[PDB]
Amino acid sequence: LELLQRKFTNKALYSWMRGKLSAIYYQFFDLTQSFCLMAQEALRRELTD
Amino acid sequence: LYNILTEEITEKNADALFAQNFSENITPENFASQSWIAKYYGLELSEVQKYLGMLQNGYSDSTSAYVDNISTGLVVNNESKLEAYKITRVKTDDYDKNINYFDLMYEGNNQFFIRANFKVSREFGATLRKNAGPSGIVGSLSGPLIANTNFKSNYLSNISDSEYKNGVKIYAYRYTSSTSATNQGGGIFTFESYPLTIFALKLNKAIRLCLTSGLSPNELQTIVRSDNAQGIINDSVLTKVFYTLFYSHRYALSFDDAQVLNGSVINQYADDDSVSHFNRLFNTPPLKGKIFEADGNTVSIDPDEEQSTFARSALMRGLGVNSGELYQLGKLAGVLDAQNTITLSVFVISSLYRLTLLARVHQLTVNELCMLYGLSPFNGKTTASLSSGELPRLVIWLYQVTQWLTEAEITTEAIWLLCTPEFSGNISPEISNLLNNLRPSISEDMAQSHNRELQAEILAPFIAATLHLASPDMARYILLWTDNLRPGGLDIAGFMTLVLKESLNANETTQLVQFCHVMAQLSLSVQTLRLSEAELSV
Amino acid sequence: LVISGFAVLGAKNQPAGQHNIDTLFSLYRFHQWINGLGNPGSDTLDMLRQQTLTADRLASVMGLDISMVTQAMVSAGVNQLQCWQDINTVLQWIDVASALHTMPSVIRTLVNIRYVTALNKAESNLPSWDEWQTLAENMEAGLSTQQAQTLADYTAERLSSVLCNWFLANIQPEGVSLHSRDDLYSYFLIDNQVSSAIKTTRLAEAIAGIQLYINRALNRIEPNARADVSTRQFFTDWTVNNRY
Amino acid sequence: ALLTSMVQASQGGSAVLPGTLSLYRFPVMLERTRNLVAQLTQFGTSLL
Amino acid sequence: TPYHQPYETIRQVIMTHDSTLSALSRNPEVMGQAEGASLLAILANISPE
Give how far C114 is from chain E: nearest CA, Å: 6
Q: Which residues of C touch B284 (CB under 8 A)?
A: 145
Nearest to C47 by CA among B42, B394, B425, B52: B425
CB proximity list for E38: less than 8 A, separation 6 or greater? C111, C113, C114, C115
The answer to whether the CB of C109 falls within 8 A of the CB of C135 is yes
DSSP C105-164: HHHHHHHH-----SSSSS------HHHHHHHHHHHHTT--HHHHHHHHHHHHHHHHHHHH
Q: Which residues of B394-413 are buried (b: 16+ CB within 10 A; e: fewer)?
A: bbeebeebbeebeeeeeebe
CA A26: distance to chain centroid?
5
**C-alpha torsion sign, points B379, B382, B386, B392:** positive
Which of B321, B312, B399 has the alpha carbon at shortest distance from B367?
B321
Residue to mutate among B433, B435, B467, B524, with most D CBs inside 10 A, is B433
Which among C51, C57, C52, C97 has a CA at the least distance from the CA of C74? C97
Q: Please state, in angstroms and rounded to a whole number, the distance separating the CA atoms of residues B175 and B179.
A: 7
Of B496, B487, B494, B491, the closest CA to residue B462 belongs to B496
Q: Give the Cα separation of B302 and B319 in Å (integer).
A: 16
Q: Yes or no: say if C94 and C69 are a contact pair by the CB < 8 Å rule.
A: yes
Residues in chain C within 8 Å Cβ distance of B310: 137
Give B141's strand partners.
Answer: B125
Nearest C-alpha in B relative to C74 = B304
Q: How far is D35 from chain B (nearest CA, A)?
A: 24
d(CA C46, CA C221): 88
Query: In whole angstroms, what is the distance from residue C32 CA to residue C16 CA?
Result: 20
H runs (alpha helix) in chain C? 21-37, 41-49, 55-62, 66-76, 84-99, 104-112, 129-140, 145-170, 181-188, 202-218, 233-236, 238-241
* Whether E and A touch (3+ CB pairs < 8 Å), yes or no: no
Cα distance between the two ends of chain D: 35
Residues linked to residue B106 through DSSP beta bridges, in sequence order: B111
Beta carbons within 10 angstroms of residue B274's beta carbon: 10
Are the CB atoms for B171 and B127 separated by under 8 Å? yes
C-alpha distances in Å from residue B417, one per residue of B522, C74, E49: 11, 29, 55
**Do residues B104 and B87 lie in contact, with contact meaning Cβ atoms separated by under 8 Å?**
yes
Count of C–D CB contacts within 8 Å?
21
Task: Compare all CA atoms of chain B with the CA of D11 and give the residue at the minimum distance.
Answer: B433
Question: D3 vs chain C: nearest CA distance in angstroms?
Answer: 6
Listing from the earlier edge strand, what are the strands of the sheet with B171-175?
Answer: B137-141, B125-128, B171-175, B181-183
Please answer yes or no on whether D5 and C45 come within 8 Å at the CB atom. Answer: no
The distance of Cα B463 from the centroid of its chain, to the nearest Å, equals 48
Question: B412-419 and B366-375 are packed helices; what angle lies between their axes, rounded to 10 degrees?
Answer: 30
Q: Residues with Cβ < 8 Å from D35, sequence gap 6 or more?
A: none
State residue B140 phi and psi, 5-degree precision.
-145, 135
Candidates D8, D9, D12; nearest CB to B436: D12
Q: How many CB pairs under 8 A join B and C?
A: 74
What are the beta bridge partners of residue B126?
B140, B173
Using CB atoms, pick whichever of C105, C141, C148 lies closest to residue B285. C148
Residues with Cβ within 8 Å of residue D33, at least 6 apart in sequence: A32, A35, A36, A39
DSSP B353-382: HHHHHHHHHTT--HHHHHHHHHHSTTTTS-
Interface test with B, best of C138, C147, C201, C202 (most B CBs within 10 A): C138
Beta bridge partners of B72: B85
Is residue B512 within 8 Å of residue B454, measured between CB atoms? no
How close A5 comes to chain D (CA, Å)?
23
d(CA C134, CA C139): 9
d(CA B326, CA B317): 10
Report helix, strand or coil for B27. Answer: coil
**Nearest beta carbon to residue C63 from set B284, B323, B413:** B413
D to A contact (≥3 Cβ pairs closer than 8 Å): yes
Burial (CB < 10 A; 0-12, 13-18, 19+), residue B490, is buried
With an 8 Å Cβ cutoff, is C52 touching chain B?
Answer: yes
- CA pair distance B350, B264, nearest whole angstrom: 8
Neighbours of chain E (3+ CB pairs under 8 A): C
H/E stretch holding A31 reads: helix A11-47
Report the chain C residue with the minimal C-alpha distance to residue E32. Answer: C111
